[PDB]
Every structure is written in structure tokens, then in C-alpha cells.
Amino acid sequence: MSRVAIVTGASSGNGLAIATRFLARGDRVAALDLSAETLEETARTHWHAYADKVLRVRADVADEGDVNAAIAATMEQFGAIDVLVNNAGITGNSEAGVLHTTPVEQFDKVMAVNVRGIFLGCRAVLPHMLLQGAGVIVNIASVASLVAFPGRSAYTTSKGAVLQLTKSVAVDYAGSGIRCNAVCPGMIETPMTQWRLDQPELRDQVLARIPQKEIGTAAQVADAVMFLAGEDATYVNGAALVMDGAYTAI
Amino acid sequence: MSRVAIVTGASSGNGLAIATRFLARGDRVAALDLSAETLEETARTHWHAYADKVLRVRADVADEGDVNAAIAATMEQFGAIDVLVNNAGITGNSEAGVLHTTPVEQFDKVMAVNVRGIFLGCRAVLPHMLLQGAGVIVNIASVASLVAFPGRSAYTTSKGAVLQLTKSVAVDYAGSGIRCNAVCPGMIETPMTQWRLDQPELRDQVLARIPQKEIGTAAQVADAVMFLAGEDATYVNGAALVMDGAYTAI
Amino acid sequence: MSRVAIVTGASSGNGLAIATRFLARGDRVAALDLSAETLEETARTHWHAYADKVLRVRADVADEGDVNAAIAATMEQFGAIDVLVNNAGITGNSEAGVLHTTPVEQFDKVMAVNVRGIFLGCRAVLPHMLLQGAGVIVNIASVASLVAFPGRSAYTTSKGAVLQLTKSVAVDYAGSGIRCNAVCPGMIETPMTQWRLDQPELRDQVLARIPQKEIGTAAQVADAVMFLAGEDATYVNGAALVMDGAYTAI
Amino acid sequence: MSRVAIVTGASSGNGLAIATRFLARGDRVAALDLSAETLEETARTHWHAYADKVLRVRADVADEGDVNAAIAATMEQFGAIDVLVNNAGITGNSEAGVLHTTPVEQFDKVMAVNVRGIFLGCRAVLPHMLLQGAGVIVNIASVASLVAFPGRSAYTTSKGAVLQLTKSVAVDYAGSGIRCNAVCPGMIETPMTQWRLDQPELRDQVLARIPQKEIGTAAQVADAVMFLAGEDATYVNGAALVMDGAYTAI
Numbered sequence A, B, C, D: 001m002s003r004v005a006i007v008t009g010a011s012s013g014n015g016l017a018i019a020t021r022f023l024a025r026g027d028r029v030a031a032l033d034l035s036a037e038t039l040e041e042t043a044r045t046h047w048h049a050y051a052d053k054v055l056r057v058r059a060d061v062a063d064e065g066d067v068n069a070a071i072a073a074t075m076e077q078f079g080a081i082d083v084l085v086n087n088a089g090i091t092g093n094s095e096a097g098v099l100h101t102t103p104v105e106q107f108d109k110v111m112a113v114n115v116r117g118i119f120l121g122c123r124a125v126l127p128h129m130l131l132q133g134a135g136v137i138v139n140i141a142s143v144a145s146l147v148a149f150p151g152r153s154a155y156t157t158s159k160g161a162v163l164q165l166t167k168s169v170a171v172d173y174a175g176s177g178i179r180c181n182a183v184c185p186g187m188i189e190t191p192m193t194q195w196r197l198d199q200p201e202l203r204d205q206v207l208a209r210i211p212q213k214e215i216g217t218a219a220q221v222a223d224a225v226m227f228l229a230g231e232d233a234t235y236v237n238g239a240a241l242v243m244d245g246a247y248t249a250i
């Protein structure tokens, strides 16, 4: 058995762990990211044993042309699309902090990548999943879809849209064999957050708000994705699986 | 006495009821909408008693220049901005239905008006509220911020972002004297929904999902906004006030 | 118009503020609490001007007999019951902390007052409101209905039940003219909690978790109750109105 | 390996699927239920292949003495308690419908089994889990913890308490190595529900409110429990995993 999974933001962090997990299970993966060079370096160092089973596609998820071509390339190469994991996401730069001082260009960029990218990915894959009569979509949202992360306004805003888009696809397509759920990770150690977590004071600060008193990992994010993408979640649809050491429970 | 409120989407529906209510209580209003012509007609038929206490400003909330100029005009005319009611919103045309068949242009327009417009409105008024040491923002979200409306994916997506943007401003600015909350209306009779609700068979399908078995009004939306904007809600911050006849409680 | 409101836990804190506000508005109030002596002293010092417009009734809300007698006495004296405010509640003693060390007796007591008491109150007033074809119920829940308060397990547990009971009544009776909503206060200064906040280090610790950087008051809880009990909230049903200075928004 | 799991309400429905699942994977189970005869009949027909690895304990979860003795017997027989699955639950009889016509005895029985039962089980196992420095608790709640089930007031009320108790345990004990989460199933076919589901009229009515247009199964509930109980959910704490075919997403 070998499902076809598309994973965005696949060259590092959560996306890399997710793509490797699908590969380790025997699935075929279309790994999409911004740099063809980085994708090849990732393939040589992390996906060496899978070589052929992973199709590396350069694509900016915020671009309709790139996304449509990536889905067309996936269909040409593997012949179906069973799972779509919309993982690509950005926080916005050092200036995308509180609302009033975040540059208009940064708000737009964060919304384009984090939300429009997910809309475009789903829009490109649904016709194929519909034809198949079955398909699974896992969106990587965040606890910021439920509570606001201080000093990260654009990001928080974008994640509220990710959660509702998730529920929208579930409601409109559950009757047609599609499953759509979101993982809502709390604080996870990745290249996106490493800058903050590397500073004792900031790390202590966020840990103070995590009852579990630990920072999550990309492997734990991949665990949740694999659960939502498989046979053990056939009745889970339109749901948010929060994986945050109880951060949102207080 | 008199507060200064900026109300977007003020020439009709909820926006009109909201603007008229602030005026009736003795406040001054900067009424922003897309058409100078319609704004004048509205001012003549609904706001004649208040004359100059209402500043009619043509503005597309999705446009940074229009919003910045509207805020500057409000400051010039009234001297402060005490309340911002981000009411303007669109559903998307008849093709903005389920996700896969919604025109990309429609998804971008709905996100631009419903979310970017709210970011731009808050980005422009916050600097002024901060210097005043007090400010209140009421965002008109929707129960679609909490559950998905079937066949209205872009709209549902945008409202998820509005609710989170609301919590973001509350979390980042509560300490500086700012209040930001959202009203989440269920089905309300307005120019935006009139077409559907006019048909008994369509109204009936909507009513079946409302335990109260009644369609809401613009007057009730205005009631919730006045509550959230005034002195009886000084400890309400970062909250969603759902007004849907129990639609979301089932 | 003079409405008849039954207010539980009326001799102190939120309940005292609520009863007082109904009286000041011209309504008649049946003030219920545990001690007739305390109620009379409360009546002499806070309700003097109203005299006969407030019926003081001794009642343990957890006791079916007391509740039924209190509703019968209200009908006899005033002839109708328009509003019921289920405010009475307890936190449990210093031993009702984390789950495993809370005495079974304390868990049972907290649940009986905070939950069974609300069930009994609603059960006793609903037949009358149904006959009147109109009635409003406001339950005083807590943000503990949505997130957990560390070291207050029984209390947190009880409030989850209050929130769902609220939703249950709204769904089953909204079509019959009944409205049922819940206020969910965050940290408020009242005798029930006014001992943790009293100690500088604790209050300070509490404030660090409230973005608005302030403790709420019973006057603000009364403000929310009045909104939910009246004419400005006719389409609000099955909702939880959070009043916490953005405590739950992060 | 070989964990020790306590599963309440283990003789039928979800509890039986959960119990069997732990056994099939090589874990040892203390199966608790109301009738020793039924547990033996079950041990005979469903667990015939594990004999010794499953300890049958008659116990009314609502009874502190029964619960304490059941935990004593599990420790004595197996030596530890690694997982507790609080599955036992009742809906109330035909008279436990809307709140006002719910016999007080039924409301009390539903709260004692569905809520006090969980408090007691958790109170009984937590000292041991803490001594071990590790432990996982999975509570079976319901979508009724989030929305109200029409005509099932006591049930709905109880499930709101279960969700918050879950968050309470997670928040107070996550730092001590304990995990506590809840599964919130939608409509599942079990002996507790077949009455309704069987009747064509009712099933259709139910299916109409489920976007996925299918009823859940005990096997799917066990799938969710195993996920929350194992190594793939080490960073999931204080969470509610909704499994309802999108029922709560609309």
C-alpha cells in the first residue's frame, strides 16, 4: 500500500518531519517548497532511502500558477492525490508584531502564504479527490487559531482563517468522501521559532504558559498529522486537534 | 456629551442601524461606505436630524489610502476617534460558494474587504486611541467565525480571521486602555441576505437551524454593538458576543 | 413596566450587585440566600428605599424543597416570574484544590450548589415562564467554563456543567419564548475570591495573567447580567458572554 | 511492553471495544462494570483469548467504595495503573428529556454516573500515577460537551462537566507527567443509542444533521482512545478530540 501525499513547506521543520513520516510508511510524497536547491539538499540528506518516491517541486503556495502546476506534476508522476497536508506557513518578520506597527506588506504576505496558500492548495486538489470519491486534507493551523499569540497579530489573524477554512471544507465535502481536519500545535521547536526558544528569557516566558512545561517537537506534530490522515480518524472531520501541552486549557 | 465613532459600511443594513444609533445617543459619526451618492441619500433620509454630526466619507476599507484619508478626515472634523465599528463586509457573489469552485478573484475580494479592511481600519485608528489613552473597537464577525456556513467558504474563512484579529488587538492593547470585541451575528435580515430570506422555502431552511425560530434584525445587531462599545462592557475584552437565536448552541 | 426577577445568592458579591440593580430599575426582586438574618441586614443597608419591592427568601439552592417554596412565595407575592438569575455559587474550601486531594464531600457540595441548584431553579421557574410565553434566565458561569482554573478542580468541573446546562435550556426552550444565557466572569473582586487577591503576591500573579491588567467588579458583572436579561439582547440565546479583561483571549 | 489499563463501563459498547483493543495489543486490563454476571459473560465471549490478562471487577463508578476497591484490586493483581479510560456513562431514562420535566432523581443519577464517577476514578488513580511519575487518562465526553443535544438536558449538562474536569486534570498534573484528554464522540451506534438509530425515522433525522452522512462506531471511538492513550500523543494534553463526522462544524 502506498498513498500519494502532497506536503507543502516540506524542506524543513514540521513539513520535513511530516514528509519523512509518509515516506517511512511506504507512501509517495510530492514535497513542495520555495527553493529547488534546498529541496534537493533535503532529499539527499533526509530522503536518501526514498529517492524516487519523493517528487521535489518548487512552488510558492501563495501563487495559483505554482500550486496548479505542482498538483498537475503530482498527478503526472503518481496518478492520484490521496492526502494534502497544507503545512507551509510564516510568522512574518521582526516587524510583524502587534497590529498597528506591522507593515501592510507583512500582513499581506502572512495572509497570502498562511491562508491564500491553503485555499489554493485545496482548490487544486479537491477536483481530483472528488473524482476519486475520497481524499484527506490536514491543515496545519495553530493554538493561535483559538487564542491570540501576543505580539504576532498577522499570524494570529491568519490562523483564525485556517481553522474556519478547515471547517468549511469539512462541511461542504464530508458527504462526498472528503475529510478535512486541522492540527493546532502550541509552541514547537522549529527553524521558525528557534530564534525565540534559543533565548532563555523568552523560552522561560512561553514555558510559563505551558502546563506541561515542555516545548513540542516536529515529530509530535507529524504524529498528529499521521493520525488525522489515516484509517484511525475516519469519523474525525472538521475538527481541531490541539497538541500544545495544555497551553489552551488554561 | 459626545463620543466620536467611525462606522464602516454605514449606508445600509447593520451599518446604517449602528450609525443611526450612535447619532441618536448624541455621538458624532464618520460614516464610511463605497458610494458618496448613496451616502448622501442615506444622510438625507435617515440622518437629516443630525446634519453635521455625521461626516460622510467615501472609502473602500480594503484600500490603505482611502482608510488613512478617512481617519485623517475624522480627526480633522471631530478631533478624536473614540470608537471604531468595523462593519463593512461582503459575502462574495453567487459563485463564491463551496471552496473548489469559488473564483480565486472572489476569494481575494472577500478576504480583502472582510479582513484586510479590518486590519487597515484598526492600524489607522490605534495610534490615535493610544495617545488618547482609551479606545474601543467592535468588529462585526459572524457565527461563521465559529462554525462553517455551508456553501459560503470564502466568507466563512474571512470570519475566522476577523475573530482572531479581534483577540489579537485585545491581547496586545488591553493594557494600554483599548477594548476590542466582536459581535457574531447569526442570520440577520439585511440587503446582503434579503434575496434568500424573501423566499419562504429558503427562509424556512434557515429557520430549521435556529432554535429560536426567528430571523435577527439590524436593530438587534446595533443593540449588541452599543453594549460592546459603551460603559456597561468595561471588563469585556477579546470576547465574541454571539447573537444568533441559539444557532451555534446546537 | 415592572419585571419580577428571582436572584440567588443575593446577600453578597455579584448577587447583591445584581439584585440592587434590578431594584434601582424599578423591578421587583425575590432575593434568595442561605441566611434570613443576613438577608434582612442586607435589606436594611442596601435595599432600604425599596422596602416591599424585595421579597427576602431563605433558600439553599441545592435543596429542591427550598427552591420550590421560594418560587411559590415569589408567585404569591408578585404574581409572576419574568427573570431568573442563577447566581449563587461556591468555590469549595481550601481543600477543594487539585482533584486528587479534594475531599469527596467538597466535590459533592460544589456540584450540588453550583450545578444542581441551577437545575432546580430552572426546573421550578420554567413551567411559569412557559405559561407566560416569555421568560429570561441568566446563569452566572465562569471563564472556568471554558478553561481550567489551576488548583480549583471541583469549581472548574461545575462551571463546565453550568455552561452546557445554559445551552440545553436555550435549545429546548428558545422556540417557546424563553431566553437562557450565561455570563462567564474572569477574576472579579468578591467575598468568594476576595482573599487570594487580598495577598499582594497572589493578586500580582493573577494580574500577570490578565491582559487588561485589572480585576473585575460585581458592578461589571451586574452590567452584563442586565444586558442579557433585557430588551437589548432579544436575539441572544444559548450564549456565553465572557467578561474577563481578555484573560481567555490568550 | 505491557501497560495496565483500567476501563470503566467495559462490558458493552464503546467500553467493550476499548477494553478489547488494549488486550489485543498486549496490555493488561481491569474491566469495570455494574454486573459481575455480564462481565463474565463478556469475558467468556469476547475476551476468552486473554483470560488472565483481564481482571473483571464489579463496580458502580458513582460509588467511592467500589472505585477505591477496584483500584486496589488492579494494583494488587497487576502492580500498576498506567492508563485510565473513564468510559462509563448513561443518558438518563425516557423521562430525562428537556430540563423542566426531568425527574430530579434522573438528573442526580446522570450527574453521579457521568461526572462523580469520573472524579472518583481520577481521584483513585492519580496517587499511583504520580508515584510512577507517569500516567494517561482518557475521558469519554461527547459533542454534547460543546453543543446541546435537544431533549437530553441532564446528559448535556453532565458532559460539559466532563470536558472541564478533563482540562482541570491536564492543567494541574501535566507538570507531573500525567496526560488527560477527552474524546467527544458525535452519534455512535451502541446499545445506549440503538433504540433511536434503529427506527428509520430517527436515523434519517440524525443523519441529516451529520455532514458526513454516517453514524460512528465503537471501533472508531476505540481508535481515538488508543491515539490519546499512546506514544503518538505525548504533547496532547487538556484537549478534546471531536469525532462526529462534522456534526459540530456547522
Ligand SMILES: NC(=O)c1ccc[n+]([C@@H]2O[C@H](COP(=O)([O-])OP(=O)(O)OC[C@H]3O[C@@H](n4cnc5c(N)ncnc54)[C@H](O)[C@@H]3O)[C@@H](O)[C@H]2O)c1
Residues within 6 Å of the ligand: A008, A009, A010, A011, A012, A013, A014, A015, A032, A033, A034, A059, A060, A061, A062, A087, A088, A089, A090, A113, A117, A140, A141, A142, A143, A184, A185, A186, A187, A188, A189, A190, A191, A192, A193, A218
Ligand atoms: N514551530 C511551532 O511552534 C509551530 C506551531 C504550530 C504550527 N507550526 C507550523 O509548522 C509549519 C511548518 O514550519 P515549521 O515551523 O514546522 O518548520 P520551518 O519553519 O523550518 O519550515 C517552514 C516551511 O515553510 C516553507 N514555506 C514558507 N513559505 C512558503 C511558500 N510560500 N510556499 C511554499 N513553502 C513555503 C519554508 O520554506 C519552510 O520549508 C508552519 O505552517 C507553522 O505555522 C509551527
Ligand SMILES: NC(=O)c1ccc[n+]([C@@H]2O[C@H](COP(=O)([O-])OP(=O)(O)OC[C@H]3O[C@@H](n4cnc5c(N)ncnc54)[C@H](O)[C@@H]3O)[C@@H](O)[C@H]2O)c1
Residues within 6 Å of the ligand: B008, B009, B010, B011, B012, B013, B014, B015, B032, B033, B034, B059, B060, B061, B062, B086, B087, B088, B089, B090, B113, B117, B140, B141, B142, B143, B184, B185, B186, B187, B188, B189, B190, B191, B192, B193, B218
Ligand atoms: N446580515 C447578517 O445575517 C449578518 C450577520 C453577521 C454579520 N453581518 C455583517 O454586517 C456587515 C454589514 O452588512 P449588513 O448585512 O449589515 O448590511 P448590507 O449588507 O446591506 O450592507 C453592507 C455594507 O458594507 C458596505 N461595503 C462593502 N464593501 C465595502 C468596502 N470595501 N468599503 C466600504 N464599505 C463597503 C456596503 O456598501 C454596505 O453599505 C457585514 O460585515 C456583514 O458581514 C451580517
Ligand SMILES: NC(=O)c1ccc[n+]([C@@H]2O[C@H](COP(=O)([O-])OP(=O)(O)OC[C@H]3O[C@@H](n4cnc5c(N)ncnc54)[C@H](O)[C@@H]3O)[C@@H](O)[C@H]2O)c1
Residues within 6 Å of the ligand: C008, C009, C010, C011, C012, C013, C014, C015, C032, C033, C034, C059, C060, C061, C062, C087, C088, C089, C090, C113, C117, C140, C141, C142, C143, C184, C185, C186, C187, C188, C189, C190, C191, C192, C193
Ligand atoms: N467572584 C468572581 O470572580 C466570580 C466570577 C464568575 C462567577 N462568579 C459566581 O458568582 C456567584 C456568587 O458568588 P460571588 O463571588 O459572585 O459573590 P460572593 O461569593 O460574595 O457571594 C456568593 C453568594 O452565594 C450564596 N450561596 C452560597 N451557597 C448557597 C446556596 N447553597 N444557596 C443559596 N445561596 C448560596 C452566599 O451566601 C453568597 O451570598 C457564584 O456562582 C460564583 O461562581 C463569581
Ligand SMILES: NC(=O)c1ccc[n+]([C@@H]2O[C@H](COP(=O)([O-])OP(=O)(O)OC[C@H]3O[C@@H](n4cnc5c(N)ncnc54)[C@H](O)[C@@H]3O)[C@@H](O)[C@H]2O)c1
Residues within 6 Å of the ligand: D008, D009, D010, D011, D012, D013, D014, D015, D032, D033, D034, D035, D059, D060, D061, D062, D087, D088, D089, D090, D113, D117, D140, D141, D142, D143, D184, D185, D186, D187, D188, D189, D190, D191, D192, D193
Ligand atoms: N453512543 C454514542 O453515540 C456515544 C458518544 C459519545 C460518548 N458515549 C459514551 O459511551 C459511554 C458508554 O456507552 P456506549 O454507548 O459506549 O456503550 P453502551 O451504552 O453499550 O455501554 C455502556 C456501559 O456503561 C456501563 N455503566 C453504566 N453505568 C455504570 C456505572 N454506574 N458504573 C459502571 N458502569 C456503568 C453499562 O453497564 C455499560 O456496560 C457513555 O459514557 C456514553 O456517554 C457514547
Ligand SMILES: CC(=O)CSCCS(=O)(=O)O
Residues within 6 Å of the ligand: A091, A142, A143, A144, A148, A149, A152, A155, A185, A186, A187, A192, A193, A194, A196, A197
Ligand atoms: C501562536 C503561537 O503558538 C506562536 S506563533 C509565532 C512564533 S515566533 O516567531 O514569535 O517565535
Ligand SMILES: CC(=O)CSCCS(=O)(=O)O
Residues within 6 Å of the ligand: B091, B142, B149, B152, B155, B186, B187, B188, B192, B193, B196
Ligand atoms: C448570513 C451572513 O451573515 C453571510 S453568509 C450567507 C450569505 S447569503 O447566502 O445569505 O447571501
Ligand SMILES: CC(=O)CSCCS(=O)(=O)O
Residues within 6 Å of the ligand: C091, C142, C144, C149, C152, C155, C185, C186, C187, C188, C192, C193, C194, C196, C197
Ligand atoms: C476566582 C473566581 O472567579 C472563582 S474560582 C477561584 C476561587 S479562589 O481560589 O480565588 O478563592
Ligand SMILES: CC(=O)CSCCS(=O)(=O)O
Residues within 6 Å of the ligand: D091, D142, D149, D152, D155, D185, D186, D187, D188, D192, D193, D194, D195, D196, D197
Ligand atoms: C446519542 C449520544 O451520543 C448520547 S445522547 C442521546 C442518547 S439516546 O437518546 O440515543 O438514548
